[PDB]
Amino acid sequence: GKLHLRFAIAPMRPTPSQTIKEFEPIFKYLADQLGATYEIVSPESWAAISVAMTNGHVDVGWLGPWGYVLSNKKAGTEVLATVKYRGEPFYKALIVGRADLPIKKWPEDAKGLKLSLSDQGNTSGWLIPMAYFKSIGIDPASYFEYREGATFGQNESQIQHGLIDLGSDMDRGRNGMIEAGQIDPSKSKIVWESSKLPNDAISVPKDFDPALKARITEILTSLSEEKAQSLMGSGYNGFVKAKHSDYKVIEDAGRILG
Ligand SMILES: [Mg+2]
Questions:
Q1: Most exposed among 39, 46, 200, 238, judged by the fewest C-beta atoms under 10 Å?
Q2: Does residue 111 sit in helix, strand or coil?
Q3: What's an example Gene Ontology biological process for this entry?
Q4: 211: CA distance to ligand 1 center in Å?
């Protein structure tokens, strides 16, 4: 009678090893509160963690917003809580450019430039920038010299080294890379920033044990900002109780894109 939990976390940092090193402590804390043993993985892409949850491989997953919406539609995955960054359950999508890129008439002056978006399960990296371009009648695949599937770490590296012109990122991710000395911010600039988006979703499978679900929610949402920050990467400092309707803006964007 030894309780065991399978954990997964999305690409919070540029590599899976950095993500696990910095964020495992919150999962270890959660398991210890329950007297559970555990295992943990961090897939390379935002799509991959959504798929792992949908296919029955994960008990408690830290999914991105679009990854949660997709898994809920396909398998009935439930959101229990939303992560806080700087005390708020929100964040912004970015399009970043080379520092010397002419942008005074953006994006009408950008035809044929090299643009890299992320995997199709990535909210800020793919869904939101695609929705932006469609809202102004631009098809990125024909308008730009276009690539899809890159990680946020790859986008920022390639911009800094002059291999692409433009790439997607999220504000909380870019901040962490600057803070860790992984980006020289003098070599890039923010070209576009979205409106506020709901943050990542702490998620469980459909019909996960009801008693355990309630306990998990209480353990995470009762944490002080100081204690939460001591267990996670810089800026991540708590959890708030959440439900499906908190993700409406993401569901709406997905539906409009088809
Ligand atoms: Mg507590």
A1: 39
A2: coil
A3: transmembrane transport
A4: 16
